[PDB]
Amino acid sequence: PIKLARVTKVLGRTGSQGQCTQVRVEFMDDTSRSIIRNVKGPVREGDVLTLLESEREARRL
Amino acid sequence: VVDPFSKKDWYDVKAPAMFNIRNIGKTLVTRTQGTKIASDGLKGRVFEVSLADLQNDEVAFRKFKLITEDVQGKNCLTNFHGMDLTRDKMCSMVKKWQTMIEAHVDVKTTDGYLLRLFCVGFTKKRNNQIRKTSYAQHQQVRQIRKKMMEIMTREVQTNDLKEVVNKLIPDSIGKDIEKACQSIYPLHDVFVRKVKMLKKPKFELGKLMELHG
Amino acid sequence: LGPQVAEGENVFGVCHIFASFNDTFVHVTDLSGKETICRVTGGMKVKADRDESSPYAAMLAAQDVAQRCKELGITALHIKLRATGGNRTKTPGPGAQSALRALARSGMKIGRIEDVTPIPSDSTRRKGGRRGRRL
Amino acid sequence: TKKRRNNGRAKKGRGHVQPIRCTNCARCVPKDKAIKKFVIRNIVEAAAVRDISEASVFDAYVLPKLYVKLHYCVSCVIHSKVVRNRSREARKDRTPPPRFR
RNA sequence: GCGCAAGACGGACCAGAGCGAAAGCAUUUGCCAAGAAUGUUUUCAUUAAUCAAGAACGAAAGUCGGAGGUUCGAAGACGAUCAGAUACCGUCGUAGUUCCGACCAUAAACGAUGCCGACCGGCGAUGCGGCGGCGUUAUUCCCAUGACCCGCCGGGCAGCUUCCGGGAAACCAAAGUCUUUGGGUUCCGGGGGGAGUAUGGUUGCAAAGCUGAAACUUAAAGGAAUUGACGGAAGGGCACCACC
RNA sequence: CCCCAUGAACGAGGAAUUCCCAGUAAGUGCGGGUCAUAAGCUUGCGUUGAUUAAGUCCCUGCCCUUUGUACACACCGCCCG
RNA sequence: GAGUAGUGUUGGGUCGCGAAAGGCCUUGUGGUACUGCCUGAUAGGGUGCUUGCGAGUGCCCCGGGAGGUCUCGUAGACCACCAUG
């Protein structure tokens, strides 16, 4: 299933070369579920991310 | 070349009448070529089964070894063999500031099965306890050991396998030790951690038939 | 091509996953364990000695045995995980973890998970020598 | 010059201690000096958690955990960075590091 | 997977915990003798402290015999790595590792700190015995008794702390009570090498152990701490002449 | 320098690597230097004018801090048979 | 009636838990909290769910009533080259 996500906070930048941003995800379905997630490119708080695999969790690079 | 797997045949392992759920599962045996009796090749097997699967209400970590003896034509007849704790739980209990206590007995049941029963316990931290450590002194320990020993001996020695297994399912015996020892020291987790088998009596169809139904 | 059972009920095999640091086995048997259904090993799927252990091997091996058992009517697998045990390592090798995750994906059912590494009460002397294995 | 007052090993008021073989090396070290570390984790790790959780035939089956006590001979630790060297004064503090937030 | 067999080893619990003169000493259970501490309005009445000579026990390896040989494993053999490796790494493997019976007497046998004794700050802990004290628990009331709890006493194993005082300093509540120098006592050191060698004596089955010089040679050798420099040691830190 | 002819390699460049964050990279001409005659070089000058990042120590490079040292002519050190 | 009957146990005790039949002799308390499950009391001992975690909040039984993606925060990040000067 395809899902949507909301940015609650920006925590740090994960990467070897300092590539990924490690961001915190609310679900736009009004659910309270909170998952950390890796995102590439620029991110500011409040943005919406589209997840193709929505059950996956964030690991440290 | 030739597929070994088409000469296979599926059989049904059904547990005895002690527990709730009957069919533990399926077992796979190569058909009789007449040089080798398949009923015999199948005759000697153990099964490692979680109690959770035999009877619906219970704890995951008690395992039963079950032996097939007779085959009923795609029914296998299973008698109790052994019992043990899942390694996970056994490790979960053991911790660093408490004394551990272990004992074991060899007992013949009334019908003649010979069992080895193992006994595990721990010193439990009292609820307001300020001191870091619950240790028990040597003589206290030995007291406990002796009582563990005494209890389960009398529990088995009086009863036949049927009632023994029946006591082992909920673990009556553990709770028994625990209550009985509160005077000497506050025992904590107390189990029969293992059950072994030493001698089965000469095999008898009738006895087993009664055990199944 | 196997057991005759309704669509609800799942046939259980017992899968032994052995991960040393050398290589993995994904080994699937009956309940008794006295009959093996299927056995695939790490060094089998991949050719190089280095790669013998590595998670990738686990992947392949697992996908394959799981397939082959999906053939024979075994849907659900009890899992007994194993580390090399005895005097040597009690950690399971890296392979096992991957392997496990893998034969989930193939659509297998997972029964109880249990950990059996042979663990000594007290062993024979370990294979290095007093001052250790230095490198 | 005496470096530690306790000489690195915890042995006090007894003469000799039963030696144990290292996890990593196999090098022999007395049980007192050995840098000990206890490990409780889950058999399956982070991601495969969520994965396997779906493939169960059981509802609310909680993953078993793996329990292992490690010993590390003084050398092997410092290589594995289980233990790192610290300053003359800050040496003296035997309070275990704050893994508790 | 199921059984069988053999010899080893007693995991986790196990700790700056115990016990032993030190070496050393962890499965259960019974038998055999010891032992500290505690308790005491018991008994003896100076019987004690330390000790040349002389003794008892003394890790590991080693040595004789016997038994036994799972694992590990000097020696050795290969396989690698390397310029070379008779070394680290790997596959093997003899003696040995194990038990019984005799020898051997040495270890960084270390607290690198003789033993008995007196006095000199605190502070919490811990082990053993004792003594007192609300209150919990072993179900509901009485006494025992055990478990926790709050103290006190005597021995212990230690710890933290401190302008007690020492100390060349590191550090030490002893390494304190030392030029304000004396409680008793035993071993023992006198620049570095030569050398724990030569010789004699003596012990052993031998490997060796104890005892132990000299010629010569040499301005330092050494101990703590301090700035440096360096590290194939650990952490941070920056820079589009580093990357993303 | 100029007119005619001659009209060849070259099909977006392997392992590696260089310079760069906003009137900036880059394209494009122009001035000054050298100069009797000369800019495929340099030094300046405008013009057209972006993609991407506002982060990280992975690599490379040096800095501190802790730490060990038998080095101090300071590791190209010292030193053993 | 009677803390008797019955029932219950580590050492004992002057015991712990605790009925009913049936009558007699005339009312035969109020106020005020809570309450997941297990064991053995609303005590004691284990053990939980609500959102990954930490807070809150709720979780004995019945009837009826409506109101619903409970609220607030939130790192929860873990998968051997190389002599000499």
Ligand SMILES: [Mg+2]
């Ligand atoms: Mg040093």
Ligand SMILES: [Mg+2]
């Ligand atoms: Mg010693």
Ligand SMILES: [Mg+2]
């Ligand atoms: Mg002592």
Ligand SMILES: [Mg+2]
């Ligand atoms: Mg043990």
Ligand SMILES: [Mg+2]
């Ligand atoms: Mg003498």
Ligand SMILES: [Mg+2]
């Ligand atoms: Mg010896």
Ligand SMILES: [Mg+2]
């Ligand atoms: Mg020997």
Ligand SMILES: [Mg+2]
């Ligand atoms: Mg011999």
Ligand SMILES: [Mg+2]
């Ligand atoms: Mg060679």
Ligand SMILES: [Mg+2]
């Ligand atoms: Mg070798």
Ligand SMILES: [Mg+2]
């Ligand atoms: Mg070998």
Ligand SMILES: [Mg+2]
């Ligand atoms: Mg002697």
Ligand SMILES: [Mg+2]
């Ligand atoms: Mg000596």
Ligand SMILES: [Mg+2]
């Ligand atoms: Mg000495």
Ligand SMILES: [Mg+2]
């Ligand atoms: Mg003396």
Ligand SMILES: [Mg+2]
């Ligand atoms: Mg006491």
